[PDB]
């Protein structure tokens, strides 16, 4: 289980941040899919820093 304030790696292979370190922001503790809001140090192409990931998509490098 992943809680807020953790450092992750990325298995979403369709992303820009794929296999990069993200420090998460929040989990939506209701049933809406892809709830892991992961802030990153690096910014993407279209200038966003955070993204919804799945709990099956984030890791626990800690």
């Amino acid at each position: 289980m992943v809680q807020r304030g953790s450092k992750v790696r990325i298995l979403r292979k369709e992303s820009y941040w794929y296999q990069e370190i993200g420090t998460v922001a929040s989990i939506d503790q209701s049933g809406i899919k892809y709830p892991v809001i992961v802030r990153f140090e690096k910014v993407n192409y279209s200038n966003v820093n955070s993204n919804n990931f799945s709990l099956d998509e984030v890791v626990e490098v800690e």
Partner: protein, 74 residues
């Protein structure tokens, strides 16, 4: 001496020409700027002004730049 420099220019040309073609081919299925590139086929105009701009992002466009290098090498 003249033959030395030119022989390295042709080498420079042969390395640069294959580079353009290989980058186009190995990134054809996808890259960070366009992860789902393979879904649009070999040749498409671009992907709009979003994500910074994507003109000349297709593998066909990659071949196209390498053609210029081919005339230059020969």
């Amino acid at each position: 001496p003249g033959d030395f420099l030119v022989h390295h220019a042709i080498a420079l040309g042969l390395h640069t020409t294959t580079l353009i073609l290989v980058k186009g081919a190995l990134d054809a299925r996808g890259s960070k700027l366009m992860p789902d590139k393979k879904d649009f086929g070999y040749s498409f105009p671009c992907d709009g002004p979003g994500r910074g701009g994507t003109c000349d992002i297709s593998a066909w466009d990659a071949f196209y730049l390498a053609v210029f290098w081919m005339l230059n090498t020969i």
